[model samples]
Target: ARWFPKTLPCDVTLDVSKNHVIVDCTDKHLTEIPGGIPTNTTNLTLTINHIPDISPASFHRLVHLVEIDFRCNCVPIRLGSKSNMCPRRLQIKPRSFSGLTYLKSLYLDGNQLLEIPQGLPPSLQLLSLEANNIFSIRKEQLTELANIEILYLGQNCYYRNPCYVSYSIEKDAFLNLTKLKVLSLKDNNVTTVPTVLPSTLTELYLYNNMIAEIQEDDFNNLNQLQILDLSGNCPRCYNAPFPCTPCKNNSPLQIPVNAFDALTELKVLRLHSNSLQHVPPRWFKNINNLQELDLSQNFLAKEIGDAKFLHFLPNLIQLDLSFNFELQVYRASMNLSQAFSSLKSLKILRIRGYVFKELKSFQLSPLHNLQNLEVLDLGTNFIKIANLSMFKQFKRLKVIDLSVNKISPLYYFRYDKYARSCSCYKYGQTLDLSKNSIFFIKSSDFQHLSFLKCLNLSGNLISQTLNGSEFQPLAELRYLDFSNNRLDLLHSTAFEELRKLEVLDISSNSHYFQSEGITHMLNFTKNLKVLQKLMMNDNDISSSTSRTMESESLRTLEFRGNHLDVLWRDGDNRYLQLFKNLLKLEELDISKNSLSFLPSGVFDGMPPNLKNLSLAKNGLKSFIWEKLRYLKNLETLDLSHNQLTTVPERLSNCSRSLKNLILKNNQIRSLTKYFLQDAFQLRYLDLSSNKIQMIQKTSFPENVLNNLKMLLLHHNRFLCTCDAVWFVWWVQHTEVTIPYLATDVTCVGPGAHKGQSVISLDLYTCEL
Candidate 1:
């Protein structure tokens, strides 16, 4: 037993480590595990298999299973059906796990079980029955899992951590779990709160349910609950623990007084997407340590004031008020910063998609200043230009996103004495203004952002020559984006002062940089002595628009999805003689450019430093592999999604250094010795999704086989007849890492086993 098993149940596969043994027999159509099975299985995964029954004493003999996942294997299909849709159901024989004493976790998700199974392992600490069709959970169904530390029963779940939703859990359903720490009841459409939750629970999720009302004792004794999600009953949805849409009736959720008085440690409360018209005044009676609160998507009311909100949450750090689209009539005390004024530790504030006509700013305004805040997201809000003081741009704040807004013209904001006096001038380091409908951007608009390093101004309608003044104080700006702005022209001095600009994205628009734009931009960017990367894909970039400029620093360039394909326009492969001068060019992507032929000196213009090159998704049928010898340092090459009948033997021209080669989705019927030789450093080679039917023994020599740690040869036309017997044996006994063979390599011919998996084939019968 100390050694791994050779002959076992269902041709089971065994994997062993110093302290545990794993037996995986998934994906096979089997009914039971016979005797002589591994007795020391630490993990037994029988998922995606058709196991209807098991030997009565099978698991009892193993005795050491730490986890058992029998998920989604009981799918039954009806004959004559158009599709093989499984009506997921299972029948586990009683006494199947009569002696799994060490079993700690069990997962039965995505099963169509009508009721819960009985007699689970007494040693279980974690149980999941997510994504099943079970209708109700009675008290007796859980009484045996009294020692479980975590229980999950959601409509859907992430295999990662007991992901969950709702079900009808009867009273006393959880009265015995004293050690239960996390309970998730997600998306079950629950209308009322359940009672008697475990006191040890640190997190509780009752999210995505249409809970109509909240009574006072709903949270009777959950003192240690650190996270609570009660949003979406009037159905608020969230990718996280908060809210999304309005309640069905558009009224406030009636959270009664003292409803959460016992949750002293609760830190996060997501209550958006409900019909809440106001904050529950008496509900937050004494909670003090709460760090994050989301009461947005609901309206602010006359009964609750910002000062009163600060009084309720003294330590709140994050607030999201994104969807209060229309403001109702309000009293004079309201302003943008009013609700956020009192929380000193507030860091992340999301007020996305607003339509503010006037936020009502005032000096020394509550809207003024804060010290520790970091991220402020204001995207999708209309008319976003405001006084510098509104952002407070104070210390510690690093990112501000004002994208998807409309600012066709500049809005001047006079300095307010009170706000100016209280400001620190510490933030505004990175600003995102992408998709904001701006007609123009002048340097003066960015005059105050001296420390700003990254700026995104993509998707607009500007058609002028941008002069240098816009970047006079932007000497530190390293990243700039002008993508998809539909500008047909750019000024020679558009970025004259951005000597520090190392990364620039001007991709996707109409009639781009006009060859001269690329030249002039590189002309003035010499302060750094080198530019690192440039993205100039899309919008009429042809040989006529390609030019040479100087930079010891231009290392990466992308020209995908553009008119580079029209470079064969007559006699001008000189489209790239412009790049040969930049000897530091290391990585380039010209994929989807439709290049079928290369001129002799084509890559000679490329510096020897090139490492990663992708000519994928193009109309290239061939290349002078001999030309690759010049870029001796190429490490990763992607030639997939193209039209290549054979991988050239001359590919060895760069074989001394190439490490990763991707030739998937191509049409190569066979590979010769030169397909891949002893480039000892090459580790990753993907040949999956191709049309190959044979492998010559010498095609992969000793060094090529031993050096390749990541290999993919799936989705090929593999023959099951004797013509491929020796190659099949070679792959099975080789040390090469073929991760996808078990799933991708199938017999597409030899009639008898047309669709059978290569690993499951009967070699002797096929040969005979």
Candidate 2:
């Protein structure tokens, strides 16, 4: 802004130095546009201002203005004296921007207006009226927007209504805009398509609307459309007055045949979150070039037209049909045996929770030509797939999700070339079986998927000792998420052969209260030679089950949200030794463990290499700093949400490395220089939600906290008297930042000034 005025109208910015000769004036609490704005400015912004309506002559001198932003201005008199900060209707006199004749782009979004501004220059090319209050769009409302190309009217029309329903879109509402390229009207409560659409439109996003059906002529004229999104449209129970609460019926959405016939250039079509029962075989007859399609959350009929229905769009790259059918109880010898037989070019398929079964011959020969396939989601199909050797043909497969099924352990293999190719059992790279109602998923469940690198078996019903060579094939497995399962009964050598397991998550098993014996689980983990991260949060593992199974390979362990109160229950070193075994541990999470006190020798066994430790959400009233004095490498520590009445004693020996200390939400009373005297290297400190009445230069000398960056001190009880002057002036020139804005450091004491901001204080009155 070298060519700018030293003192402008408001605290906003105005830059005209860019190559486009643009000017920006956003987030300025300006009440009106001032005179003498440079005439050479081409682009200007006045967004997020508190200006009440503006007249036409406001920008009479901006003759070369090509773009201007007036969004979120114009506070209305209708919402008189409302207390909350919700958007109020903004009043704009007609033709408020007619002076900007050269403007090619205009933005009036989020202004809570009643209609499109009158007097928008006819030369406009792009317009954004999103998040407004306009109710209807009649024909005459669009005649002058002929030259505009992109129009976004999403989240308008249905203003006073709850989420979506009927709003009028009179006929020929868009006929004059024959050159339009993109139109977005999502979440507008539009239950029906407009009578006309421009053929030049390439993208149409009407997602989250109330449209119930698509007429044959709704898309027949759009020859150049490539992307169409109608997701969350016509859901199970949605009608007249919005929000789809207690639905109308469980009926299926009726998509007429040849509904998308003329869209030859269409590449992506999203129609998910609806109540559609059938997808006719001819729906994709000519769309051989289609790349992506989503049909999740609908009522896919009994048999999706013999699986040959996909024979039309052979070039589809990604397809999703999850939750497409009801929970079927019957079984068969073979169902959908050849379904999707010709999807040779398909790369990704998501069919979780479908209702298809019966398999005398699930060969799916036509699907063998998947030239570039990778991921397949078959989780929650609700069938007992004791034998899933059906995926042997996918040579390049990598990841597969098979969770939420009742798959048994007796998976059998065939002996043909189809079976021989499966020497690489479908655990191609990753396999997930979470939420599957199986009492046991033994080693034989997936013996041939030898290249398994990641496997997830969380949310299962495994209830007994798990020890077997089932995982001997996963020699290179690196990540395993076996959380929320019955690890309480794990065998001493459960994970015996997973030598390469690096990350393990066995937490949140709510049903296995007494069964998750901590010793048996670690006895199983002792075999993992290179395990790095161990996540066991939200389990029942406690100090009462402590046993030493030393490990030299473990580095990080998270044991939060459990019952580890045994640290102070027995008053001995027997239980404290549980953490001493991992001599090389770097990070540990022992938060929310109901810990009341720490036995003397407990910290003796803590690994010296520890860097991050959290004991948040406990009952400890004070922290014994001497116990943690040897943590030379500690960088981050969280002691928040405790019963402490003040800040913990500083780590005198390890203060050089402490970076972040979270002591917020405590009962600390006041702050003096001794509070954080030795925390010289601290980078972030959070003291919000405390009971501090005042922080004086005595608690913190200005020179001590030179490296501090972000400080959270909001919600603390601060005095607003003249003593606040000492703290307020220090914050003005310091490298530290308080969470509240300059004017929002609200006062809580000194009853008269309690409600006023400290920054606007009349300090002169305190001289008396």
Candidate 3:
């Protein structure tokens, strides 16, 4: 009954919309299951196919199927003639989902399936078999599911084809399922807490397992947990990349004091990283509706001076005592201010890298009654705030991360108005003094913030002039990250009272900046004028006698790696029209400028409403494309790396709003079948690494890949012959996205498929 000119199947696609019908067939190197689908397909996405086996009447005619993404349709097998390849696993015949009575979500995750897949269709309720190998899970293999509710059997023993065994479950396995509610046996190598779950679990991902001990009657029949992810069992394996072992002599996950004392509808509790050494005091008592409590990277330095069990979690809201690496809190150990004075609905308070060496106000006056705190992560606490009026009592504090605290140039935001305890209110609006070692920043160090709106003095060593007015009392600064500072001058009234500056990052202050400090940093954006993004990337300006730039509410202009080829090959007509009056420039990043050839009127002062353009890593060999002839609303064009070899069959004016043509890396060998002819709204086409070995089929512009969306040919050198096998059959039956097409789109050859994977070639032997 549901039909409409739907003669699909050439790499299936159909998508209906207003409530269903999808169809997609992912990465179609399909080995089977392509029979005229659509029996009112409700949703069928056979992901990354090889489709080993699934007989028992496959989908029983898509009976209004409702979600079944058979993930990573296995394909490894190198059986006889030489053995040793192995990976082909998914074979699901027994009533292969018999009569799919409106199947409801079943994603067989990254399969290898040594078990669990027989007649699974009781109107499934989300069952993703995460990275399968299925070591064990008895209970008659989930006693008929009982309308299972969200069950992702977490990575069968740690990812990357990991299936060695011991991941048991059996005992009443999930006791007749009884409507399971979200259960993910995280990194399954289970050791504790699996005493047969399913108490109508309200989300429980037993974090990276091999559990070390957790027994107060385990979960005492679930108690309907509200999101409880026991973080990485006992991990902290310093720099762990994988292969982790630290837990035996490093002990951690051994929770006891009434284990979770019956969840009590626990609300988000992830005991992070875990080599614990504390945190057991009644363990959040009766949970008291705990709201987000992650005891981060533990060792809990003497339980943070007896945390007092965070005063019984008074409805705690987001409190992560971050990286317990010896969590110190000076000023006579103020006993963590009576355990943060009973939370008071604390709003995001991560004591990041808690080594508070000196932060006055009696070390945060025990968070001064929280006041509904909003984000106050004391980043890498090399603390030394001494006393910024202890943050005027939160007052709805808005982001104040004192980054890598080694803070130096501190007048401590002077003009403290004679410190009547520093008048409050005007909530802190983002002040992350980044990677601090602060060098010089007088003007009374931000004269009293003035309700700072994003001011991250990036990494710091802030050298030389900003003198005009040291940010003249912020004036509600709109994002000003003095990037990796060492910056040598920027005085044109430094920022003339920041006219509502909009993003002005003085990027990587390179080689101290000569040529009059790059014309006082491009005439300090001629007084902001609602300046929109002016990141002076790698400021080693070769020359800049600033000229045109009128700011004109600039829309992004990152001047990358400033060797601007000695001001565009020395002729320097004031840096060749130095971005002529900007003209509302719309995204223009002159990338890593080492320019080899560009001259032609040097972008004739570009900016005709330019829409995103970056001459990436500029070692550009030669580029003329009619010298950008005034952008014409260009749309994403990065000419990656560069040594270009061709790809401008015409773009004299953004060829019709060019749409992403990044030419990755670059050395683009060939693609001349009138490529890019009028772009036709191209959509993302980055020829990765390049030296492209044949790319015909009239190369491009034949509908330009039908509005192509994502086509980055991985590390190119693909000469897999047979006239380039139609670009690897349009990169495996084109749907456009060629991202890592089967492992970085392989094949570097001239013969027997050197290095294989052109989506496993064999397009019927290239159609003979």
The 0-to-1 C-alpha lDDT of every candidate, in the order given, reads 0.65, 0.68, 0.72
TM-score of each: 0.85, 0.80, 0.36
TM-score of 3: 0.36
**Predicted candidate 3 versus true structure: per-residue lDDT over 56-75, tens digit per residue:** 67777778888878786762
Model 2, residue 275: C-alpha shift (Å): 6.0
Model 1, range 204-277, lDDT digits (tens) per residue? 98766657788888788888988887755563232324234446556567777678899999899877655466
Q: Is candidate 2 or candidate 3 better by lDDT?
A: 3
Each prediction's RMSD to truth:
7.5, 8.0, 19.2
Task: List the candidate numbers ranked by TM-score, top first.
Answer: 1, 2, 3
Write the number of the candidate with greater TM-score, choosing between 1 and 2. 1
lDDT for each residue of candidate 2 in 31-119, tens digit (9 for 90 to 100):
67655666777877887666666666777777888887777564222322245333446667767677677889988876677777766
- Higher-TM-score candidate among 2 and 3? 2
> Which candidate's lDDT is highest?
3
Best by TM-score: 1
Arrange candidates by lDDT, descending: 3, 2, 1
